[PDB]
Design a binder for this molecule. Sequence first.
Ligand code: NA
Ligand code: NA
Ligand code: NA
Ligand code: NA
Ligand code: NA
Ligand code: NA
Lengths: 322, 322, 322
Amino acid sequence: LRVQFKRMKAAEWARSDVILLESEIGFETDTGFARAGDGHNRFSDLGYISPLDYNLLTNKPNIDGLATKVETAQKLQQKADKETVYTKAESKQELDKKLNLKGGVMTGQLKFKPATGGAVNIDLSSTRGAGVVVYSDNDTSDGPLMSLRTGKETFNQSALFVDYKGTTNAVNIAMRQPTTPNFSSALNITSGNENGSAMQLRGSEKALGTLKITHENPSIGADYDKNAAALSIDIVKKTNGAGTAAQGIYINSTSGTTGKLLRIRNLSDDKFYVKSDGGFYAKETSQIDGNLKLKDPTANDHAATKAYVDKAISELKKLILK
Amino acid sequence: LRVQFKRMKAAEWARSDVILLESEIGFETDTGFARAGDGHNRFSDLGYISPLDYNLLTNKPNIDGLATKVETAQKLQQKADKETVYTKAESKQELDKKLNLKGGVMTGQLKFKPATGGAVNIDLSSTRGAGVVVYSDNDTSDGPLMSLRTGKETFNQSALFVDYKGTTNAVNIAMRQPTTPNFSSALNITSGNENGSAMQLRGSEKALGTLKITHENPSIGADYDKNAAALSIDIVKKTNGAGTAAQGIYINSTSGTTGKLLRIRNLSDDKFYVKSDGGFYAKETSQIDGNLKLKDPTANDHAATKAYVDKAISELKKLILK
Amino acid sequence: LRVQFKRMKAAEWARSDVILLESEIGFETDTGFARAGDGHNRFSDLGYISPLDYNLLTNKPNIDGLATKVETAQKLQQKADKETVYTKAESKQELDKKLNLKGGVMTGQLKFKPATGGAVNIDLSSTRGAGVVVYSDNDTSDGPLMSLRTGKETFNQSALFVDYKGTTNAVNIAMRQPTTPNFSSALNITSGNENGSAMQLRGSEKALGTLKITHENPSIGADYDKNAAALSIDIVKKTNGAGTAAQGIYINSTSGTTGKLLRIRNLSDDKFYVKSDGGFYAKETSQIDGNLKLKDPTANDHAATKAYVDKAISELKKLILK
Ligand code: NA
Ligand code: NA
Ligand code: NA
Ligand code: NA
Ligand code: NA
Ligand code: NA
């Protein structure tokens, strides 16, 4: 036997009314596939003669090891997008533009506009360095090293307040000798306030002056500084004013002193002084371009008055002539 | 021939002892599947009549193109989690709160507590702007523009040290004329140290005063300032003290000067002076409410003493009366 | 009928010349698989008797739900790599090292080297706190609280400029009383410039002194301060110099004053003064260790000259003797 089976093309079968017997095979001539009858169904309703169920295959791929689109998308949701985060390089670029608390170099202006005190507060209690150090070795400039300004007439605090305990000078100003001399001063002060002293000084020295001024000859030449003075006072009118009545020096002691009010010495020898009572001493021959009004003499070394002379002359006259 | 095959349900086959001949087909009536005998195996041990091996399929999916869960997880491991990284927007928010080295506006206190010197160091050698600029146009305040304070009696440095070379004033203080006059000063200094001068000044002028004081009439009225002075000195006791012996002005020259020790002028004309030797000159008639003790006259314009008069009178008496 | 089919091993078939009739089945004895003839093809060119097309399977896996390697890689490309981005913890570590505009504590030096003015600009117009507060409660130190230095002789601005409107002192320096007295001053000023006054002061007081100096006894003892003065002046030569000709005090009024040029009081009583014309008054008995050159007396209380005496004596002599 070489058995052949009922057979036609797959399309021909699908329209055929031929009913295969139970187990009887029919063959699709253009596909090479067989189906077996159940004794009632037409051929298009028969199944193939061997399984076509993925579950039944051998050598299946490892499907359960493969990622799903859903699970992948869920995980990617937790990850940061490149676009919306800075790289370390970018972060470093940004951070390098900002000041370290450790210290740094500012290249632009630091402004304070406020929202122990101070906008700037420097506590040196634990260190041996300076607080604020400003310097310029520039030839010239358009601004001072430091400027303090108040703008309202009511302003009720100082521009600069120095509260000092210590063993050296609270404030020291040194104007160094220039290569060539110029018109400048170490300290210049002006006030246009008529109801307060431009400068006030108070001290409580045991054996020194409250203000001590020394003039030192800038030259070795004995009379180079013949026009200099330790203290120089000028008393002037207002521009376009009619004059002035201001005094030069005024000395008082509101509680009463027993000291000399003015004492002038040279080589530490008293040369001229005004005692606490107003009497004076002068060490050498002196001159008044005028008269001197004084009391009649009582001691031999007292200056005689005109009245004393005239009386002596009159008495002698009366005595001689009888 | 319509051939039919040995056949029963799949479950019936699996328990059957029927041995199919080699190539003989048996059919599962409930599944439609066939298996062919090997001449010895029972039906449950026979394979189906067509392959069920995934490898042999046509139109296979592209498995090798699909991502594995393992490879995906390995790659995701290298990616940054959203939760643990700042967005650019967040980074910007944080950076904007920090000071740029370029410059910026502080709104709170900058404190220095330290771990060429200075906690703050400003070098203006290459620029033409100011160093530290403090100002207030506030009506009033509870603090000074600038405050320097030292707290220990041993402190061995100054609060403020000015070391100045230049062509203008090292320190300039201007107290501007107020709308209406008040009791304030441009500079006020107090010291309670008994062993040092409250203020010390030293200069080496060729032809100027070490201290120069000018009083200017605040008015055009010729005697408006009749009660003013360029220098005013007061000499007072301690509160609850018994008195004072302090001197007013003390002048000396420890090395010896040939200059006038006090020289008083008006309109640049000498009116009264004390020479380096202590002799004085006064330009006009003067008054002592007391006697004047001096030497016997030798020149015609010398004041005569009582002794000189008395002797002249005595000699004349002796001469007349024989 | 138990039908058996032409059959041999799969390898034997692949070399066989046997041509199966159309639909005739041949069996591979070692594989259990059948193929059916087309009436012309050799067995290796026949297809199996049931489909082997993946598309036709039932129970297929959800391939379209599985992620591809390509799509996964494309998505991962948009995600940030851990290595190249800082964590929040790292960002915080870096930010905490930088200064907040709100305020902060510097622990290192803040330098300004510059690329209303000031490297540091403080505007207190809207607040009641201080600007710059420097202090030290250290026992000692190697630097001042504040230092201002200029290095070139041409420098044309001040180290410190105070421009002040207000109701209190522009600058106040208080040297507090030390536990034990020492050699220090509240303000020390030196200048080596020969062409400018070390210090210049100008004021326009109505009824006060431009400079006011008070000395206060540091003790309750009436003569404790017997060696003190409100003002002390010294006039010295240069080291290795030949001497000095500098004056002590120089007073002038370049426009002409009608005030007393020097007025010395005690307990607010005039004791000695030099009038605007140079005549003086002294309240008590005085002494010159020398002669006094003056004018011939015209009033009874004028000091007599030697010439006046000698003339009176001569006239009396001529009168008596005829
Ligand atoms: Na005395
Ligand atoms: Na002496
Ligand atoms: Na001289
Ligand atoms: Na003149
Ligand atoms: Na007058
Ligand atoms: Na009085």
